[PDB]
Amino acid sequence: PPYHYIHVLDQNSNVSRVEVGPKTYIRQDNERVLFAPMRMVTVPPRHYLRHADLEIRLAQDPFPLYPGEVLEKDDGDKVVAGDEWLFEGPGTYIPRKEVEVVEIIQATIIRQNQALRLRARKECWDRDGKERVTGEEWLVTTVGAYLPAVFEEVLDLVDAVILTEKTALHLRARRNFRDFRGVSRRTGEEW
Amino acid sequence: TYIPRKEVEVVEIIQATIIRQNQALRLRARKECWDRDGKERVTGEEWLVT
Amino acid sequence: PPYHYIHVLDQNSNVSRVEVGPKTYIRQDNERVLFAPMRMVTVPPRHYLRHADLEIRLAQDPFPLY
């Protein structure tokens, strides 16, 4: 069982300690008790100088709050502080002192006659493995739910213009490129 | 009879849907899965069972 | 039969225990009794540190809450 604990301060030496309480305590006349018998910290399975820094305790056996400790809340490679990265699909996240859960990212559903418009929030590389400078925009065509990389700002879904033998689509080039059939387009060209 | 456990949640009760011969039932993949015929279905894809 | 139980605390050693009650209990003067005699748990057939975790018990012979 967990029982309780008490804090005992030596009025002579000023040293403070914790006494766990399945036992019955009898204090010396120089000792003072700072706290009445109170319960241990008891983290249930999968719940959601040691305190100069920060510590997160997971499913431990019942433990007392030692003097100088506080209940502040009810890697394979060298991650540099300020770096950002994306966590895996729905599951349980194990927290750390160095890592911040900045936001929760909802994947966007893309159907067959759609594409998703993305923008590089800072210089990055796309999922195809190509460079994207700041403010550059591009389209992703893979069907299903698309999960954007940390630096890919999602804008909107672009649906395909369905052609018929009674219609054609009139386009202008915003910049130079090679088009959907590989034809080289100059800026302000129309077809 | 379902016999309970500490690890497992009974989230919901699922009613089966009746399909007659000149009908089919329309389904959507709520996340990526495989159908009962054994074929992949990406998120938001829809199909018919007969 | 199930009878009942009582909870007995030693005021000296601070240990608490359970006494199941077809017996008459006569307490030693260091002991206190926390509860009047109350029924076992009695799960009927096919109804539908042991509690730091969680446990669900099926169709047991009558048992006290330790």
UniProtKB/Swiss-Prot annotation, chain B:
Function, in words: Required for normal vault structure. Vaults are multi-subunit structures that may act as scaffolds for proteins involved in signal transduction. Vaults may also play a role in nucleo-cytoplasmic transport. Down-regulates IFNG-mediated STAT1 signaling and subsequent activation of JAK. Down-regulates SRC activity and signaling through MAP kinases.
Subcellular compartments: Cytoplasm; Nucleus, Nuclear pore complex; Cytoplasm, Perinuclear region
Part of the intact protein present: 150 to 199 of 893
Expression across tissues: Present in most normal tissues. Higher expression observed in epithelial cells with secretory and excretory functions, as well as in cells chronically exposed to xenobiotics, such as bronchial cells and cells lining the intestine. Overexpressed in many multidrug-resistant cancer cells.
Record's protein name: Major vault protein
Domain remarks: MVP 3 mediates interaction with PTEN. MVP 4 mediates interaction with PARP4.
Induction / repression: Up-regulated by IFNG/IFN-gamma.
Domain of life: Eukaryota
Post-translational modification: Phosphorylated on Tyr residues after EGF stimulation.
MVP repeats (start-end): 16-50
Oligomer and partners: The vault ribonucleoprotein particle is a huge (400 A x 670 A) cage structure of 12.9 MDa. It consists of a dimer of half-vaults, with each half-vault comprising 39 identical major vault protein (MVP) chains, PARP4 and one or more vault RNAs (vRNAs). Interacts with TEP1. Interacts with PTEN and activated MAPK1. The phosphorylated protein interacts with the SH2 domains of PTPN11 and SRC. Interacts with APEX1. May interact with ZNF540.
